[PDB]
Design an enzyme around this catalytic site. Structure first.
Site, short mmCIF file in Angstrom:
data_model
loop_
_atom_site.label_atom_id
_atom_site.label_comp_id
_atom_site.label_asym_id
_atom_site.label_seq_id
_atom_site.Cartn_x
_atom_site.Cartn_y
_atom_site.Cartn_z
N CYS B 106 44.44 -8.05 29.87
CA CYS B 106 45.02 -8.30 31.18
C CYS B 106 45.96 -7.20 31.62
O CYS B 106 47.03 -6.97 31.02
CB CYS B 106 45.74 -9.66 31.21
SG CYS B 106 46.54 -10.01 32.80
N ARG B 109 49.98 -8.04 33.23
CA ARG B 109 50.98 -8.71 32.40
C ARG B 109 52.45 -8.34 32.73
O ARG B 109 53.36 -8.95 32.19
CB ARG B 109 50.69 -8.49 30.91
CG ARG B 109 49.45 -9.26 30.42
CD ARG B 109 49.22 -8.94 28.96
NE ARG B 109 48.47 -7.70 28.78
CZ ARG B 109 48.34 -7.05 27.64
NH1 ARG B 109 48.96 -7.51 26.56
NH2 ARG B 109 47.59 -5.93 27.57
N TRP B 278 46.57 -13.48 41.02
CA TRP B 278 46.02 -12.88 42.24
C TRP B 278 45.22 -11.67 41.90
O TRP B 278 45.43 -11.03 40.89
CB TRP B 278 47.13 -12.50 43.21
CG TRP B 278 48.16 -11.54 42.63
CD1 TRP B 278 48.05 -10.15 42.46
CD2 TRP B 278 49.52 -11.88 42.20
NE1 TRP B 278 49.22 -9.64 41.94
CE2 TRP B 278 50.14 -10.62 41.77
CE3 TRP B 278 50.27 -13.07 42.13
CZ2 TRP B 278 51.45 -10.57 41.28
CZ3 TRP B 278 51.60 -13.01 41.65
CH2 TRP B 278 52.17 -11.80 41.24
N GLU B 283 38.10 -6.09 41.36
CA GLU B 283 37.39 -7.22 40.79
C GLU B 283 36.33 -7.73 41.78
O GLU B 283 35.21 -8.01 41.40
CB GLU B 283 38.34 -8.34 40.42
CG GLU B 283 39.24 -8.07 39.21
CD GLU B 283 40.26 -9.22 39.00
OE1 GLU B 283 39.90 -10.18 38.28
OE2 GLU B 283 41.43 -9.17 39.53
C1 HEM Z 1 49.27 -11.91 38.58
C2 HEM Z 1 48.10 -11.44 38.94
C3 HEM Z 1 47.14 -10.98 37.91
C4 HEM Z 1 46.40 -9.76 38.00
C5 HEM Z 1 46.41 -8.74 39.11
C6 HEM Z 1 45.63 -9.85 36.74
C7 HEM Z 1 44.69 -8.83 36.42
C8 HEM Z 1 43.58 -9.06 35.51
C9 HEM Z 1 42.37 -8.20 35.50
C10 HEM Z 1 42.08 -7.04 36.42
C11 HEM Z 1 41.55 -8.72 34.42
C12 HEM Z 1 40.20 -8.26 33.93
C13 HEM Z 1 39.30 -9.39 34.42
C14 HEM Z 1 37.92 -8.96 34.84
O1 HEM Z 1 37.69 -7.74 35.08
O2 HEM Z 1 37.09 -9.89 34.91
C15 HEM Z 1 42.32 -9.81 33.84
C16 HEM Z 1 41.78 -10.55 32.72
C17 HEM Z 1 42.56 -11.58 32.03
N1 HEM Z 1 43.75 -12.01 32.47
FE1 HEM Z 1 45.02 -11.34 33.99
N2 HEM Z 1 45.80 -10.93 35.93
C18 HEM Z 1 46.74 -11.60 36.62
C19 HEM Z 1 47.23 -12.92 36.21
C20 HEM Z 1 46.90 -13.57 34.95
C21 HEM Z 1 47.52 -14.86 34.50
C22 HEM Z 1 48.49 -15.73 35.27
C23 HEM Z 1 46.92 -15.07 33.17
C24 HEM Z 1 47.17 -16.20 32.23
C25 HEM Z 1 48.17 -17.06 32.43
C26 HEM Z 1 46.01 -13.94 32.89
C27 HEM Z 1 45.26 -13.73 31.65
C28 HEM Z 1 44.04 -12.96 31.56
C29 HEM Z 1 43.06 -13.25 30.51
C30 HEM Z 1 43.13 -14.26 29.38
C31 HEM Z 1 42.03 -12.27 30.85
C32 HEM Z 1 40.70 -12.01 30.21
C33 HEM Z 1 39.72 -13.04 30.77
C34 HEM Z 1 38.43 -12.91 29.99
O3 HEM Z 1 38.46 -12.39 28.83
O4 HEM Z 1 37.41 -13.30 30.58
N3 HEM Z 1 45.90 -13.09 34.04
N4 HEM Z 1 43.52 -10.16 34.55
C1 LIG Z 2 44.09 -15.13 36.21
C2 LIG Z 2 43.21 -14.01 36.74
C3 LIG Z 2 43.71 -12.99 37.54
C4 LIG Z 2 42.85 -11.98 38.01
N1 LIG Z 2 43.29 -10.98 38.83
N2 LIG Z 2 41.55 -12.03 37.70
C5 LIG Z 2 41.03 -13.01 36.90
C6 LIG Z 2 39.53 -13.05 36.60
C7 LIG Z 2 39.19 -12.71 35.17
C8 LIG Z 2 37.87 -13.27 34.65
C9 LIG Z 2 36.77 -13.57 35.67
C10 LIG Z 2 35.47 -12.80 35.38
O1 LIG Z 2 35.11 -12.85 33.98
C11 LIG Z 2 33.69 -13.04 33.75
C12 LIG Z 2 32.77 -11.95 34.32
N3 LIG Z 2 32.67 -10.98 33.23
C13 LIG Z 2 33.20 -11.45 31.97
C14 LIG Z 2 33.39 -12.94 32.27
C15 LIG Z 2 34.52 -13.54 31.47
C16 LIG Z 2 34.21 -13.35 30.03
C17 LIG Z 2 32.89 -13.37 29.56
C18 LIG Z 2 32.68 -13.20 28.19
C19 LIG Z 2 31.25 -13.20 27.66
C20 LIG Z 2 33.79 -13.00 27.34
C21 LIG Z 2 35.11 -12.99 27.87
N4 LIG Z 2 36.22 -12.82 27.10
N5 LIG Z 2 35.26 -13.19 29.21
C22 LIG Z 2 41.87 -14.02 36.43
#
Ligand code: HEM
Ligand SMILES: Cc1cc(N)nc(CCCCCO[C@H]2CNC[C@H]2Cc2cc(C)cc(N)n2)c1
Ligand code: HEM
Ligand SMILES: Cc1cc(N)nc(CCCCCO[C@H]2CNC[C@H]2Cc2cc(C)cc(N)n2)c1
Ligand SMILES: C[C@H](O)[C@H](O)[C@H]1CNc2nc(N)[nH]c(=O)c2N1
Ligand SMILES: C[C@H](O)[C@H](O)[C@H]1CNc2nc(N)[nH]c(=O)c2N1
Ligand SMILES: [Zn+2]
Lengths: 411, 407
Positions: B106, B109, B278, B283
């Site tokens: 993320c 953070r 947000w 994305e």
């Molecule tokens: C405040 C605004 C936020 C921004 C701009 C942000 C940004 C991002 C971005 C760009 C990704 C990569 C996701 C993708 O490409 O699909 C990401 C993934 C992630 N974020 Fe953050 N985030 C934010 C808030 C949060 C919050 C509130 C949490 C948890 C409480 C969080 C936890 C995660 C987790 C666990 C992933 C990985 C999801 C996965 O593996 O599929 N995010 N976030």
């Molecule tokens: C909280 C938050 C903030 C922000 N700016 N953006 C997000 C969206 C993050 C996850 C949404 C998209 O994730 C999907 C599309 N590609 C990977 C899939 C999530 C995923 C898939 C797999 C196989 C593993 C993994 N760790 N996570 C969430």
């Protein structure tokens, strides 16, 4: 054991078994991944197993594993090692070895070409003047008037580590950098320190933005010596844009021949500390990194200015927009002048096909995702969506420390 | 054991010590790096509880105090007696925040400590879950001025009474494969969309139909609920220069809200824990719109721009990519809905890494996910070495519930 990689765009799943032949360490453990870390005198002892491994591979490749010719050669190398503490490669083994080091180079997106490589055997070279002549011939042959051919020149192997051949330049062709009393840099900031060594060694510096550096060459552990590459041998391309006529007046050019000279080639335990190799450019290497890195030519501002983009907030994506134009210009220029270049779409698509062919014929293709994915437009290239496994196979190309940090001066 | 990370743009070197408290395993060995792979009892539980409570009590400057020892004592006896335990509110809030703090993938953070935690541990039915989720959505949306939040349903028990949100995100668009062979709407959701219909959803069969929620309370069969449309804020996508852009009829939703993950705190497992922040503009504009297996709109846009599509080397894909991304950002900003561009976000994350190294001794980061999917090397994170390791509390990926459920 088997390992699967998935492509998330296609759902194609591949199975890796080649990783079982892996030796060197990755830097990673079960507790830490060092995937984005840029950097994560042998005894007869360790040498013969490394020699045997290599010769076993070489003989399998030619369908002669276990032949008398295989066995004789093992015995021959064995004796040479116990007698002299080292051994010499046959030309065929050198050629095979150099091709495989490229094939195994996991950070190289251009590997579809690994089998077409001109190998120049420079193991009879004894002096820096001799090294200069070899390098000139490589530059001329590789350049081939814009119709680039891949090539490597291989200088004598390490003996006691006190007699190394080294090319001090990181690349055969690069531009000088000059730090000014006011803190600004003229030319390439990446080459300031090497530029200073050259000046120190007697180079007369023109002090312009695009001065081709002299070769700094070390033979047999001696102090290095300077040589200017004949300018007529240095192909360059003036950068212009197909639609913007003011692009030419930025004064940009670049050289056509990318040629890495600072790496170490390992073959069957032997160490070639001077092994300059060259191919052709992917457009982004110049248009993205060389031009637009903040620590490099850093031209984003000037380009966006001339495009009259909205530059007050980053969310106008003015940098992204200038970035694309510059890269169009680079490709346009090279193409118009008939100098070989590949765009990042074609290169990555070709690499995916190479990679699959490798899985089928070889049981794997080690690949470093951090490097393979281009530094612009990442996810609209197929490699972004490709899972990759990174591991080390020999023969290999290794980073080595810059020679000015280790060399013992004779004076 | 003490490890350095270097930024190659700035020469700043940071020293990482926090990795030594790493617990879980990476997928990597000294022989094979798996950095780019997407997915690489009473006795077990007390170590996990203790490890957590030790760091909790340390964070509040009360390590080795009676209150520390008394709680270690209390949780200790509660486990032996009940085979699980209950977190105090303070612990729940601290753990949830830290799960985000530890999320190596993320980029956002810098915000980790501003997270509104909704304790839904008293929930018992799907309707209850629906109610909690609507409240979350409305609170987080906040008429466009987005606020980060998580809603935490009851923890796993015998594993046969799991709470789950079947949706991968709270708000996503449906996907229907066609007699035409092509796909209408979002191809990522075809499978989920069919399960909704098979469970009774009357689908409108349009390109941007907000999916119904599919909620599973207490291991029961899941149930359908339409989020009140008035709670789902969407943004029409227009361009500040190309008038024709609006005619593509593109829209996206304002609230990114991941609902399929597992939250682990002090050994306890919260299998339904939807959370939201947000968007970073890329994305939507780079991934949602331009992925070939997604809305895949590059070709149509390039044609509207009349670019030379003859040859890859004209960079027409790249050109249309930038414009599309300008349009996403422009629309969100116009309609006053929180969004961040990749330049600003990654710059924030470098500042955050600095803070974390200085105040915590490190920051786990996954470079493959942190570097944006466009314009990588002109953002500072491209040049920043990162170490990736697993800390707890954590969010973990879980298998899609339909491959686990028995009906
Ligand atoms: C405040 C605004 C936020 C921004 C701009 C942000 C940004 C991002 C971005 C760009 C990704 C990569 C996701 C993708 O490409 O699909 C990401 C993934 C992630 N974020 Fe953050 N985030 C934010 C808030 C949060 C919050 C509130 C949490 C948890 C409480 C969080 C936890 C995660 C987790 C666990 C992933 C990985 C999801 C996965 O593996 O599929 N995010 N976030
Ligand atoms: C909280 C938050 C903030 C922000 N700016 N953006 C997000 C969206 C993050 C996850 C949404 C998209 O994730 C999907 C599309 N590609 C990977 C899939 C999530 C995923 C898939 C797999 C196989 C593993 C993994 N760790 N996570 C969430
Ligand atoms: C034929 C045209 C070629 C293309 C388009 C190509 C493409 C590339 C690119 C884009 C990189 C990353 C460069 C960077 O970001 O700095 C790279 C790295 C590399 N390539 Fe290739 N390459 C080609 C030929 C070769 C040849 C002939 C060899 C050796 C025989 C080779 C071995 C390597 C090695 C060892 C690296 C890593 C360099 C390092 O770690 O500094 N390449 N190549
Ligand atoms: C043969 C060939 C073909 C082609 N298309 N491109 C090339 C260029 C290879 C890379 C040359 C520039 O690399 C520099 C810039 N950043 C990292 C540095 C090389 C390097 C540095 C470090 C610290 C480690 C490492 N492995 N490699 C070579
Ligand atoms: C820190 C990070 O590993 C470093 O910036 C890498 C990222 N990927 C790269 N990829 C290529 N092809 N060349 C590079 O110099 C780098 N630099
Ligand atoms: C194979 C590779 O791991 C995969 O495509 C990753 C690359 N980086 C990513 N980065 C982010 N932020 N989100 C993603 O879905 C992905 N996908
Ligand atoms: Zn790794």
């Amino acid at each position: 054991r088997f390992l699967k990689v998935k492509n998330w765009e296609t759902d194609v799943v591949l199975t890796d078994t080649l990783h079982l032949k892996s030796t060197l360490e990755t830097g990673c453990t079960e507790h830490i991944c060092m995937g984005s870390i840029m950097l994560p005198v042998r005894t007869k002892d360790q040498l013969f197993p490394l020699a045997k491994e290599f010769l076993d591979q070489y003989y399998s490749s030619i369908k002669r594993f276990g032949s008398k010719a295989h066995m004789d050669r093992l015995e021959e190398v064995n004796k040479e090692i116990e007698s002299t503490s080292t051994y010499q490669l046959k030309d065929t083994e050198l050629i095979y070895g150099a091709k495989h080091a490229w094939r195994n180079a996991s950070r190289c997106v251009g590997r579809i070409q690994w089998s077409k490589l001109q190998v120049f055997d420079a193991r009879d070279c004894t002096t820096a003047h001799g090294m200069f002549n070899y390098i000139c011939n490589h530059v001329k042959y590789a350049t081939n008037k814009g119709n680039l051919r891949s090539a490597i020149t291989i200088f004598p192997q390490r003996t006691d580590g006190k007699h190394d051949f080294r090319v001090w330049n990181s690349q055969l062709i690069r531009y000088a950098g000059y730090k000014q009393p006011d803190g600004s840099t003229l030319g390439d900031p990446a080459n300031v320190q090497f530029t200073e060594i050259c000046i120190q060694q007697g180079w007369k510096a023109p002090r312009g933005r695009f001065d081709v550096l002299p070769l700094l060459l070390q033979a047999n552990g001696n102090d290095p010596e300077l040589f200017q590459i004949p300018p007529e041998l240095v192909l360059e391309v003036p950068i212009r844009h197909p639609k913007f006529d003011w692009f030419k007046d930025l004064g940009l050019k670049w050289y056509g021949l990318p040629a890495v000279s600072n790496m170490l080639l390992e073959i069957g335990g032997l160490e070639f500390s001077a092994c300059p190799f060259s191919g052709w450019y992917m457009g982004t290497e110049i248009g993205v990194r060389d031009y637009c890195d903040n620590s490099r030519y850093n031209i984003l501002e000037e380009v966006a200015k001339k495009m009259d983009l909205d530059m007050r907030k980053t969310s106008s994506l003015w940098k992204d927009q200038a970035l694309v134009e510059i890269n169009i210009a680079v490709l346009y220029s090279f193409q118009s002048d008939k100098v070989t270049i590949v765009d990042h779409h074609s290169a990555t698509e070709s690499f995916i096909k190479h990679m699959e062919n490798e899985y089928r014929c070889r049981g794997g293709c080690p690949a470093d995702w951090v490097w393979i994915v281009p530094p612009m437009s990442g996810s609209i290239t197929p490699v972004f969506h490709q899972e990759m496994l990174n591991y080390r196979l020999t023969p290999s190309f290794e980073y080595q420390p810059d020679p000015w940090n280790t060399h013992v001066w004779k004076g």
